[PDB]
Amino acid sequence: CGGIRGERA
């Protein structure tokens, strides 16, 4: 969930 960004599902 995210990692090096802001996104999930």
Determined by: NMR
Q: Can you read off the two tokens belonging to residue 2?
A: 């995210």
Any idea which residue has 């996104």 for tokens? 7
Any idea which residue has 């990692």 for tokens? 3
Q: Can you read off the two tokens belonging to residue 1?
A: 């969930």
**CA pair distance 6, 9, nearest whole angstrom:** 11
